[PDB]
């Protein structure tokens, strides 16, 4: 299928090139260099075709990934293959850097020859049997990303959470695991949708499997309803003639008072013609940065069911006042030690029928780490 496969750096030169078919020529890589890196027409599509020649491009670190073919293949498979190539590169030599790429010629050549022939991608499959641990221990990490579009009128415009499971098991033998959570859909939550690892067996739906060795992701899931909102933002904008704006932003901690927030980031929008801003903060530190048109107020810790606010004076430069300032939404970035979804783990039944040790020998470790995704409050 795939013939030539070429990679660039930010400087634009060819780094490593191999072609599996007679169809691809140097003209392809040259046109890719000229028409992507050297072409100033930025607006494009992630794929392109010139003179019946398909070009595939993606940028990571400062490295271009170029794939070229003649036929009507499926894009997704090739893209997955490219992601796999990049990921195995990162695994083999950590950070992806130009010299780091360079010092691996034999690795590159042997991998491309093995993993890929003539454009065809070549490559219990998750855990062996000889794994032993006298200290049967497992760790649970609950990672959830909160997404909110918040209206100036006090209604949630959109809300949805992307959640993934991260677990670190160290157990002897071939443990048989049954995951128990409030899947009643009294504690109960509803799973909007979910995708799993290969080890998960379909047969409330519970998860029965033998976990892979070490750290792995059991399942991928999405939640959209009944999401606990971490924060509430109260916008207030006042215009003062043609020289000043009076904007005071209030934020509500929508979680338990016993919970302390960490690394609170609030980005307050200001116009480009802002002549200056005076910062007032009772908690943390507040800064004004005229460059990117933002007011930086950071709160180290601030408890739930509580409130914090910033008093700001936004001094405007007189300008073409007829075209009014279109207010961007108020964005906040934060990390919470709880899951906004509300998931509750009933149990994790892990049993080893083969070896003569009980479930009490397992040290099961659980923690919640919530992250902010897109959290914007329109004003």
């Amino acid at each position: 299928m795939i013939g030539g496969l070429f990679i660039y750096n930010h400087k634009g030169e060819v780094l490593i090139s191999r072609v599996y078919r007679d169809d691809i020529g140097r003209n392809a890589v040259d046109a890719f260099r000229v028409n992507v890196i050297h072409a100033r027409q930025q607006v494009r599509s992630p794929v392109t075709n010139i003179a019946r020649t398909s070009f595939f491009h993606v940028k990571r670190s400062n490295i271009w990934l170029a794939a070229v073919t003649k036929q009507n293949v499926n894009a997704a498979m090739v893209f997955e293959f490219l992601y796999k190539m990049c990921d195995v590169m990162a695994a083999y030599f950590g950070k992806i850097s130009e010299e780091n790429i360079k010092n691996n010629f034999v690795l590159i050549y042997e991998l491309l020859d093995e993993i890929l022939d003539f454009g065809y991608p070549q490559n219990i499959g998750w855990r062996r049997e000889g794994i032993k641990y006298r200290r049967n221990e497992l760790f649970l990490d609950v990672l959830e990303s909160v997404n909110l579009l918040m209206s100036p009128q006090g209604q949630v415009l959109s809300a949805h959470v992307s959640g993934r499971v991260v677990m670190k098991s160290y157990l002897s033998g071939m443990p048989e695991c049954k995951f128990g959570m409030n899947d009643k859909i009294k504690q109960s939550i509803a799973i909007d949708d979910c995708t799993f690892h290969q080890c998960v067996r379909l047969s409330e739906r519970s998860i029965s499997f033998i976990p892979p060795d070490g750290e792995f992701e059991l399942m991928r899931y999405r939640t959209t309803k009944d999401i606990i909102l971490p924060f509430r933002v109260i916008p207030l904008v006042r215009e003062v003639g043609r020289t000043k704006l009076e904007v005071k932003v209030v934020i509500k901690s929508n979680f338990k008072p016993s919970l302390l927030a960490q690394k609170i980031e609030v980005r307050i929008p200001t116009p480009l013609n802002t002549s200056g801003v005076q910062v007032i903060c009772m908690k943390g530190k507040a800064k004004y940065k005229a460059s990117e048109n933002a007011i930086v107020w950071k709160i180290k810790r601030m408890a739930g069911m509580k409130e914090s606010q910033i008093s700001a004076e936004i001094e405007l430069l007189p300008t073409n006042d007829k075209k009014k300032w279109a207010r961007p939404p108020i964005s906040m970035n934060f990390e919470v030690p709880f899951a906004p979804s509300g998931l509750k783990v009933r149990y994790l039944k892990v049993f080893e029928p083969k070896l003569n040790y009980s479930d009490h020998d397992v040290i099961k470790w659980v923690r919640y780490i919530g992250r902010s995704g897109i959290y914007e409050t329109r004003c």
């Binding site: 760790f139 649970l140 030690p337 783990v345 994790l348 099961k364 470790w365 659980v366 923690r367």
Partner: peptide
């Protein structure tokens, strides 16, 4: 942080 399950 991690809590005993």
């Amino acid at each position: 942080d991690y809590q005993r399950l």
